[PDB]
């Protein structure tokens, strides 16, 4: 029935475990949170933050038309 | 139309005078287990 | 002894060969009914004045459809919700103008099926089964009175039913989008849940079966001939398949036990079709799909369209063209 | 403001008052 | 009492299933989930109230449980305005009170009682298949329903009426001083057609209606009480019937389907006893309402609103309903039935009477007609107002649609259930509720079909 | 909790499932509130 | 003003100690005898702040 | 021992997730897809693609976020990281739209993975590969419907956005542009997923309700062992139960067992053949005798005809937001509309 | 809204209502901590 690796419900339900978890689980979580609320991740993935959906020169949708030069197309479009 | 209407009105009673009678008639034992209730 | 007492030995009988039983004796009438008027109204049905607006809408085969376009149209929006038997009319021409053929069909089909899954409990009865086959078909049967019933009732009108054919459930289908954005419902998600995974749970029962298959014949005959009817032992082995299953994914995701794997197989789609029944169930009040238009706005307060956006410009334009004549006012409040 | 905080408070003693009555229960030999 | 399965044969999941023959823990499990329905009615009633703005209307602030209080007439005045905050909050400190006792009476019963009641009292032990003691409960819960029935005949005529919608002078809390004991009235409301323009007891139009049924349905309870504690039950009832736990708790959730479903086309239909200005307008009432607002917007533009047809050739305005009665064009053509307190001032003998429409129309009819097209029960499940082509600005689902949603839901899993359980009580009362017997199964021993 | 260097596994189900709701809770929080909310 | 808000508090309080208590005496069989007599007061105790809590609406 | 055999032993463990050789292609290339998917709708816009918001990150919801598809102007541009519109930048590559063809191939590659290590391992447990035939079905829709179909048409544009709501304007544009519903193969694909949906649930219930009774337990479930013999339900009597409820019956348990297996895969392989059809805008779209007729006719109605307008309506409302690389400026006045509406 | 005098409780208004769900969860918290038998 075991495979060879350690039941999980002995593994989850062990002192260190939950020692090493008690500290990863939450600084994954806090890491994840200071990942957005610094805003890194909108340098990151070029995603627009609230107020660049539309600069004062561009009121439209920066929709792509270049095939090729496309970063000289979002630098314009910013 | 009145003749189809009581037509329809006979014809309907009576089936449902059927289902309502056979259902009374001790249909708990008509079945293959235990029929005593 | 009694002639009753035969009566109802003959209803009740395991030996005839379709079961009649007392709800058989409601479902074959109004079953027989509603097929007779279904095929005539099908084939040579006049143009039914679905709107009310003296726009009649040719439903028939005679009438120039084809399979796929032809309908049983629904009964008029004059009519509304109330009731047209053929003696509340003045003339057959007229209880067919006005689309008592679908009032018709639809009460004596919705009878029927109510009674093919009371008349389903009772054959488990009078067979020593156990008694929940008729649990599962309530799931057809809940959606069938939701879009022929729940939703007239709710809207107000038997115009509003869907229509009794092909092309007339699409129509039905886009509208009910336009005006409830059922596919924004979780109710019909987890519709598309139950009949997906019900599928998929269906390729992978019959996979699986038809891969641990116990090798009873040669390979020149067809496999299906190494079960016989009435056998008792089984015919494929279940360990095998379990054992593939639990490495396919992981051990503890397969079952073992059969019977908790049936009752899986049964289960899930038919709470998915009970939900998508209860969505169209109340929808049928307008209590409609998720509405998220607009939702995102920049800083300064424009609108940062999302797929919902477009998903509400296909559903403003397939409402403004709806019942195009049928509209006087600026709201389709029903 | 200090209404989603006490509406938070609120909310945390009363999802612990559960547990805490089956973990008394089973720490102490409750008939459980 | 078995706590396992193995000592019951029932699993976790099917727990409660081991309370059957459990007679004092069954009563436990009973009076807590009382407890619960009593909670429920008093926190949700003390939320309802912190979340209550008196000024707005009901209808426009996600309440279901105020407007039950105020169409009893408690805290309202002329046209559903509130006067008073207290009453409600008064229902809702009595049911949480009512609750903590009904909770701690429960969880004694379910947690210390006599697991069973007949080794101590031969008048509540019950065992399921004694059919005197389980029709003398029957006989009990019908008194005290009988009593509750003429408790609300009493509310409204001896202790300041109910909110009647068609009051003259506008809807008012008024006392019911003539009730209709008359029988034909009241019983030949079951046997109308539930179709449009009958509408079965769904049409009950008058709070007078309301009452006298309420005093006929009490004294019905009370004599039938009477009657299953003075009687047992006869012969074509024992033949008929499945005598166990599970048959009547199957035969209760018929009933209870049956209520639900019956609950939801009252509050979706009905705007006597689920008045509009509590529970807003109906579907039809918000139709009928738009066409009357145009109607009132386009003769003010001296528009001919009689001879005005439109593009079909129907009236745009006017139109004949299919019997010859003079009804709004349109869409709503459908909902020709609608009677309102707001439109039945402009009703003629034939229909809407065109001198009425003419030079009679107010302007808190226009105002209401106004309110009513606007609150129409449309709204998405993120209760965003208007039809689902509307943007995200109008927070609005009408109360009659939840009403109407929940319990057309809650009736259809409860005819679910009575399948299930009716069912199950069959197999069992039968003996093969567990399987097939493999010596003794039945088709083996029958002929072959063909 | 009452074992030998153990953690009983429905408390630790119970804490995750609190966790998990919390956060589903929080999700559905804002929905109303900030980015998402149409206000 | 000031005081009937205190006696709300003590009987949210009190609420909140028998919500703890009330299953766990009613679970705790082989305490009985001593949980019995408190359980009774307790009950008593509740029930006079809720009328006292009704009287102080009344005099608020 | 040779290294390829002590690889092979490795691969092939009997472990708690199997590896196999088909692991090789399936872990890394599913991985890559499904972290993609969360990544783009947590993270990456289609503002430069779309005008439109996809991610969590620009305040979407599960039901409002997407990988979505790429930029018309890139045709069927495989949009490689390292290809000459991103140019290696990554963040140029988030917002073409890269990730779509990330997700889409990389799926793909791991769906290949999926069906061998279906091969793989019936072949080491011994069974028969109906598992991995079966998933034929599901391999054939992804491979019409997300890369045949945008294959025929423009670009990548026109693929289906891997998102809950850009899925359902993929079904809604199918149906405006295509007429979607009125093709047969669609109508077979309905068919067959609603057989199979039906054939689930009637096969569960027959059994539940079937069973014998071979414990002492009123919970069923435990009347059964892996290793028994005999069978835990009576074919006989939901045989005859069936014979006599619907006039036929199933009566081999293997027919019945391919029967489930066969009607939804049959469905999805042809929905699939509709899909390819609709790629090259090959559609089941009209019903040219009732256009004649309803063009001579103005009292010829029927369905066919309203869901006709139903389409031209959903077209003209909907192009300039689905489509906006095209700058399709409808004014007011020529947008399609019924009366008052 | 609330009368003044109860104005100090009104996040514990707030959160009332949902306690039936506590309860039906408590029995699957109360079947763990058992053992679900
Ligand atoms: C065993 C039992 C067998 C029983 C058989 C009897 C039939 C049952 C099914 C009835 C179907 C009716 C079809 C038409 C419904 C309808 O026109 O409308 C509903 C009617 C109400 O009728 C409406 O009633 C209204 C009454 O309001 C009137 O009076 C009001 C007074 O305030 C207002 O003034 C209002 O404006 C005014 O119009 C109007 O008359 C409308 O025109 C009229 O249509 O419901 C009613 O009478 C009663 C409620 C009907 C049942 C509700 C549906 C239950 C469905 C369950 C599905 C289960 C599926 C499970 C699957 C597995
Ligand atoms: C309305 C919901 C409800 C109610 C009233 C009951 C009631 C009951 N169930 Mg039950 N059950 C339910 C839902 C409910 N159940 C659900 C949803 C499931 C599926 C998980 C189960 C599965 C189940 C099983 C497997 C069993 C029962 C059993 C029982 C009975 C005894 C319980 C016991 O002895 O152990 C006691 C449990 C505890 C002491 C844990 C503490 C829980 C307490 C009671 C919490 C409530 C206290 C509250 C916070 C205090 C308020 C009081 C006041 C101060 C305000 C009892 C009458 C048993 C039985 O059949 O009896 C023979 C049994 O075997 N149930
Ligand atoms: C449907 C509800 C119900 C039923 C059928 C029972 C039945 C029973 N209880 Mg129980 N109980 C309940 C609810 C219920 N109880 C509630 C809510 C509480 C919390 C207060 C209790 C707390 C309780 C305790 C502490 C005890 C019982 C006991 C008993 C048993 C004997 C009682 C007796 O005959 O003495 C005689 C009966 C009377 C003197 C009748 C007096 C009239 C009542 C009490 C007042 C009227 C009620 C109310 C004001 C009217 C309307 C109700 C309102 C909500 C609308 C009996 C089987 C005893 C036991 O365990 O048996 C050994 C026991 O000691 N019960
Ligand atoms: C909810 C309270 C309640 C409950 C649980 C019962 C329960 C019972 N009653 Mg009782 N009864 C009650 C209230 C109640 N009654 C009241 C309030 C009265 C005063 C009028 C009576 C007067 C009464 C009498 C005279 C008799 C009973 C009898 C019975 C027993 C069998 C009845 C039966 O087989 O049903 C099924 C009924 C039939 C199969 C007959 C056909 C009825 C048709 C199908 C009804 C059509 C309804 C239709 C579908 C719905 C439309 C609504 C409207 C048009 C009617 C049963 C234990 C019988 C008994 O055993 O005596 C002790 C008996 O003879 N009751
Ligand atoms: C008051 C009415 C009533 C009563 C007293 C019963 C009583 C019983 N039922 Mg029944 N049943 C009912 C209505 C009722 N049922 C309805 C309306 C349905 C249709 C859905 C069913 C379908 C049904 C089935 C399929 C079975 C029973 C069974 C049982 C027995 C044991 C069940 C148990 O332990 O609970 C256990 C409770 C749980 C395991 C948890 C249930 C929680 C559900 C799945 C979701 C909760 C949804 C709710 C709205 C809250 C939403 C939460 C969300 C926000 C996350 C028991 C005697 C069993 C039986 O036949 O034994 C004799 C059984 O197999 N019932
Ligand atoms: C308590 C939950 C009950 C809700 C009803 C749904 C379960 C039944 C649906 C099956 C329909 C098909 C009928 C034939 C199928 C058939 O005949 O079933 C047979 C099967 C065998 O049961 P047994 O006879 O061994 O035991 C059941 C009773 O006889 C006594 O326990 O019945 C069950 O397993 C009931 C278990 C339900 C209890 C847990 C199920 C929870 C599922 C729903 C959870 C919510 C889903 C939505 C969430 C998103
Ligand atoms: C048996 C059993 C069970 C059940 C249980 C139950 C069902 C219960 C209950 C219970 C209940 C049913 C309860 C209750 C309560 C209540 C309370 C405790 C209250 C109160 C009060 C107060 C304190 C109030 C206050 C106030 C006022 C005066 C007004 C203003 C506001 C406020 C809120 C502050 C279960 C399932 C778990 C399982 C196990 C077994
Ligand atoms: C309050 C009110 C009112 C009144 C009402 C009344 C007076 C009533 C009643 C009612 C009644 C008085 C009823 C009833 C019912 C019945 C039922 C619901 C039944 C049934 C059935 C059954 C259940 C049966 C079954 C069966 C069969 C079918 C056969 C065989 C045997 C058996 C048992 C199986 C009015 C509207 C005026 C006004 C408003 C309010
Ligand atoms: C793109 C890309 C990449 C990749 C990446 C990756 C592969 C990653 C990842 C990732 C991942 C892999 C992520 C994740 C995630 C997640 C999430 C976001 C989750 C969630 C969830 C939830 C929310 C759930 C909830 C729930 C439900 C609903 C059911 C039951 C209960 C609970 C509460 C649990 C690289 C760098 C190569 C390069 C560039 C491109
Ligand atoms: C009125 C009032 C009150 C009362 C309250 C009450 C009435 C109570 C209660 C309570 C309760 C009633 C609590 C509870 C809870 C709970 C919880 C927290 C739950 C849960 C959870 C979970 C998370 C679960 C999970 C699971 C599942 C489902 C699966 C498997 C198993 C397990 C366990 C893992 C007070 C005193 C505050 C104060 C005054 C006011
Ligand atoms: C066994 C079950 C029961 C079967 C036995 C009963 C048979 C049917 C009896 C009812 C017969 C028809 O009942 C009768 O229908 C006619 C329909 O013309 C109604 O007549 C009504 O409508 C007609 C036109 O539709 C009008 O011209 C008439 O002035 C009006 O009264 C009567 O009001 C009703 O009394
Ligand atoms: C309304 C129903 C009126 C009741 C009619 C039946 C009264 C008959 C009295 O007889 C009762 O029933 C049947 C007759 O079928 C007998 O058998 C029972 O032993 C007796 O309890
Ligand atoms: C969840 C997954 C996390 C996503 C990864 C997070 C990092 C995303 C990229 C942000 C890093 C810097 O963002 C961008 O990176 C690219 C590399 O792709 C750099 O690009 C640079 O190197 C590349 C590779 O030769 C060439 O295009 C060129 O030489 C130059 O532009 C850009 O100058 C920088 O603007």
Redesign the interface.
Do not use: C
């Given at each position: 029935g075991t495979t060879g690796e350690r039941p999980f419900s002995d593994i989850v339900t062990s002192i260190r475990y939950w020692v090493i978890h008690s500290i990863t689980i939450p600084m994954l979580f806090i890491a994840g949170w200071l990942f957005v609320s610094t805003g890194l991740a909108y340098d990151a993935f070029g995603t627009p933050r609230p107020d660049e959906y539309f600069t004062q020169t561009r009121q439209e949708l920066p929709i792509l038309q270049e095939r090729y030069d496309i970063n000289q197309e979002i630098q314009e479009f910013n | 139309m009145l003749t189809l209407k009581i037509a329809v009105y006979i014809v309907v009673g009576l089936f449902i005078s059927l289902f309502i009678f056979g259902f009374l008639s001790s249909d708990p034992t008509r079945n293959p287990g235990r029929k005593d209730f | 002894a009694s002639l009753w007492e035969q009566f109802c030995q003959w209803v009740t009988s395991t030996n005839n060969r379709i079961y009649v039983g007392w709800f058989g004796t409601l479902m074959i009438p109004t079953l027989l009914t509603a097929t007779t008027c279904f095929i005539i109204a099908f084939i040579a049905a006049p143009p039914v004045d679905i709107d009310g607006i003296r726009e009649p809408v040719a439903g028939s085969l005679l009438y120039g459809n084809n399979i796929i376009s032809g309908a049983v149209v629904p009964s008029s929006n004059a009519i509304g919700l109330h009731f047209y038997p053929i003696w509340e009319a003045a003339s057959l021409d007229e209880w067919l103008y006005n689309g008592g053929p679908y009032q018709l069909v639809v009460f004596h089909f919705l009878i029927g099926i109510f009674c093919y899954m009371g008349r389903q409990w009772e054959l488990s009865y009078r067979l020593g089964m156990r008694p929940w086959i008729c649990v599962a078909y309530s799931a057809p049967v809940s959606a069938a009175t939701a879009v022929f019933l729940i939703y007239p009732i709710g809207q107000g009108s038997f115009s509003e039913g869907m229509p009794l054919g092909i092309s007339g459930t699409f129509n039905f289908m886009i509208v009910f989008q336009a005006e409830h954005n059922i596919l924004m419902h979780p109710f019909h998600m987890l519709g598309v849940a139950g009949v997906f995974g019900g599928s998929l749970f269906s390729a992978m029962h019959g996979s699986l079966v038809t891969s641990s298959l116990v090798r009873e014949t040669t390979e020149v005959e067809s496999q299906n001939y190494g079960y016989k009817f009435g056998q008792e032992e089984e015919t494929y082995n279940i360990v095998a398949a379990h054992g593939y299953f639990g490495r396919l994914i992981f051990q503890y995701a397969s079952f073992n036990n059969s019977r908790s794997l049936h009752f899986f197989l049964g289960a899930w789609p038919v709470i998915g079709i009970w939900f998508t029944a209860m969505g169209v169930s109340t929808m049928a009040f307008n209590l409609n799909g998720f509405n998220f238009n607009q939702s995102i706005l920049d800083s300064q307060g424009r609108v940062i369209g999302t797929w919902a956006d477009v998903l509400n410009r296909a559903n403003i334009g397939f409402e403004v063209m709806h019942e195009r004549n049928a509209h006087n006012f600026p709201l389709d409040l029903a | 403001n200090l209404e989603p905080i006490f509406q938070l408070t609120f909310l945390g003693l009363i999802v612990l008052a559960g547990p805490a009555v089956v973990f008394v229960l089973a720490f102490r030999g409750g008939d459980l | 009492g078995g706590?396992?399965?193995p000592s019951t044969?029932?699993?976790?999941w099917?727990?409660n299933?081991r309370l059957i023959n459990l007679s004092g823990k069954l009563l436990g499990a009973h009076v807590a989930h009382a407890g619960?329905i009593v909670?429920?009615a008093g926190?949700?009633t003390?939320?309802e109230?912190?979340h209550?703005?008196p000024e707005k209307p009901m209808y426009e602030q996600g309440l279901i449980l105020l407007p039950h209080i105020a169409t009893l007439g408690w805290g309202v005045g002329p046209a559903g305005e509130v006067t008073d905050?207290?009453p409600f909050?008064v229902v809702g400190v009595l049911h949480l009170?009512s609750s903590?006792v009904l909770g701690?009476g429960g969880?004694?019963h379910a947690?210390?009682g006599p697991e069973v009641l007949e080794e101590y009292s031969s008048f509540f032990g019950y065992d399921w298949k004694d059919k005197n003691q389980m029709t003398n409960i029957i006989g009990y819960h019908l008194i005290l329903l009988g009593c509750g029935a003429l408790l609300l005949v009493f509310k409204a005529m001896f202790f300041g009426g109910v909110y009647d919608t068609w009051a003259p002078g506008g809807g008012d809390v008024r006392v019911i001083t003539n009730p209709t004991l008359n029988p034909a009235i009241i019983f030949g409301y079951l046997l109308k057609?539930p179709?449009?323009?009958?509408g079965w007891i769904i049409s009950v139009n008058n709070m007078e209606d309301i009452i006298g049924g309420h005093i006929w349905i009490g004294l019905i309870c009370i004599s039938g009480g009477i009657w299953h504690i003075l009687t047992k039950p006869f012969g074509?009832a024992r033949?008929?019937?499945?005598?166990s736990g599970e048959a009547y708790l199957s035969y209760s959730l018929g009933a209870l389907s049956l209520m639900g479903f019956i609950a939801?086309?009252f509050v979706?239909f009905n705007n006597t006893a689920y008045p509009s200005e509590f529970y807003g307008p109906t579907?039809?009432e918000?139709?009928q309402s738009?066409?009357f607002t145009?109607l009132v917007r386009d003769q003010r533009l001296g528009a001919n609103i009689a001879s005005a047809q439109?593009?079909?050739?129907?009236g745009?305005?006017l139109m004949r309903?299919?019997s010859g009665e003079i009804i709004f064009?349109?869409?709503?053509?459908?909902?020709?039935?609608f009677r309102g307190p707001w439109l039945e001032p402009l009703r003629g003998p034939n229909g809407l009477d065109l001198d009425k429409l003419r030079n009679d129309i107010q302007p808190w009819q226009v105002r209401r007609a106004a309110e009513y097209?606007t609150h129409?029960?449309?709204?998405?499940?993120?209760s965003?107002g208007?039809?689902?082509?509307?943007?995200?600005?109008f927070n609005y689902?009408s109360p009659?649609?939840?009403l109407?949603?929940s319990h057309?839901?809650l009736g259809?899993?409860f005819?679910?259930g009575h399948?299930?359980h009716?069912?199950?009580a069959?197999?069992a009362?039968?003996?093969?509720?567990?399987?097939?017997?493999?010596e003794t199964?039945?088709?083996?021993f029958?002929?072959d079909?063909? | 909790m009452f074992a030998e260097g153990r953690i009983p596994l429905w408390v630790v189900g119970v804490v995750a499932g609190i966790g998990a709701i919390g956060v589903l809770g929080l999700f559905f929080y804002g929905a109303y509130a900030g980015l998402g909310s149409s206000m | 003003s000031i005081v009937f808000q205190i006696a709300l508090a003590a009987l949210v309080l009190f609420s909140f100690v028998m919500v703890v208590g009330v299953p766990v005496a009613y679970a705790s069989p082989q305490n009985w005898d001593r949980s019995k007599p408190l359980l009774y007061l307790g009950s008593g105790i509740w029930a006079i702040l809720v009328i006292v809590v009704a009287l102080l609406n009344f005099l608020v | 021992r040779g290294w390829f055999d002590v690889l092979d032993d490795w691969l092939k463990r009997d472990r708690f997730v199997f590896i196999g050789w088909s692991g090789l292609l399936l872990f890394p290339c599913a991985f890559m897809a499904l972290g993609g998917w969360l990544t783009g709708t947590t993270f990456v816009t289609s503002w430069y693609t779309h005008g439109l918001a996809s991610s969590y990150l620009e305040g979407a919801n599960f039901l409002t976020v997407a990988v979505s598809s790429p930029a018309d102007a890139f045709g069927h541009s495989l949009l490689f990281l390292w290809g000459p519109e991103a140019q290696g930048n990554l963040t140029r590559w988030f917002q073409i739209g890269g990730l779509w063809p990330f997700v889409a191939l990389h799926g793909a590659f791991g769906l290949i993975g999926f069906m061998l290590r279906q091969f793989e391992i019936s072949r080491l447990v011994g069974i028969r590969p109906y598992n991995a035939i079966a998933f034929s079905g599901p391999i054939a829709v992804f491979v019409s419907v997300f890369l045949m179909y945008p294959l025929g048409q423009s670009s990548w544009f026109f693929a289906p956005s891997f998102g809950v709501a850009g899925i359902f304007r993929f079904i809604l544009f199918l149906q405006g542009f295509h007429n979607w519903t009125l093709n047969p193969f669609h109508m077979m694909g309905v068919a067959g997923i609603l057989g199979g949906a039906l054939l689930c649930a009637i096969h569960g219930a027959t059994v539940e309700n079937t069973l014998f009774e071979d414990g002492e337990d009123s919970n069923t479930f435990r009347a059964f062992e892996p290793t028994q013999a005999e069978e835990t339900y009576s074919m006989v009597t939901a045989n005859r139960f069936w014979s006599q409820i619907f006039g036929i019956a199933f009566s081999n348990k293997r027919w019945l067992h391919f029967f489930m297996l066969f009607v939804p895969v049959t469905g999805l392989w042809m929905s699939s053949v509709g899909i390819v059809g609709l790629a090259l805008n090959l559609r089941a779209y009209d019903f040219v005798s009732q256009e004649l007729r309803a063009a001579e006719d103005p009292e010829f109605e029927t369905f066919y005809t309203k869901n006709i307008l139903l389409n031209e309506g959903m077209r003209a409302w909907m192009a300039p937001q689905d489509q906006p690389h095209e700058n399709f400026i409808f004014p007011e006045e020529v947008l399609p509309r019924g009366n008052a509406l | 809204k609330l009368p003044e005098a109860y104005q100090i409780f009104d996040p514990l208004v707030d959160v009332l209502p949902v306690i039936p769900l506590f309860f039906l969860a408590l029995a699957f918290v109360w079947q763990a901590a058992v053992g679900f038998k």
């Open positions: - | - | - | - | 706590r396992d399965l044969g029932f699993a976790w099917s727990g299933a619960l909670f429920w926190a949700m003390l939320f109230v912190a209550f703005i905050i207290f909050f009170i903590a701690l969880i004694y947690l210390r057609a179709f449009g323009g009958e074509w033949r008929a019937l499945i005598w939801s086309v979706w579907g039809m918000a139709s738009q066409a145009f439109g593009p079909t050739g129907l745009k305005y309903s299919p064009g349109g869409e709503t053509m459908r909902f020709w039935d097209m129409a029960p449309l709204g998405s499940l993120n965003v208007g039809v689902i082509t509307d943007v995200n600005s689902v009659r649609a939840w109407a949603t057309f839901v259809f899993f005819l679910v399948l299930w009716a069912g199950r069959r197999a009362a039968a003996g093969f509720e567990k399987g097939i017997d493999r199964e039945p088709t083996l029958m002929p079909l063909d | - | - | - | -």
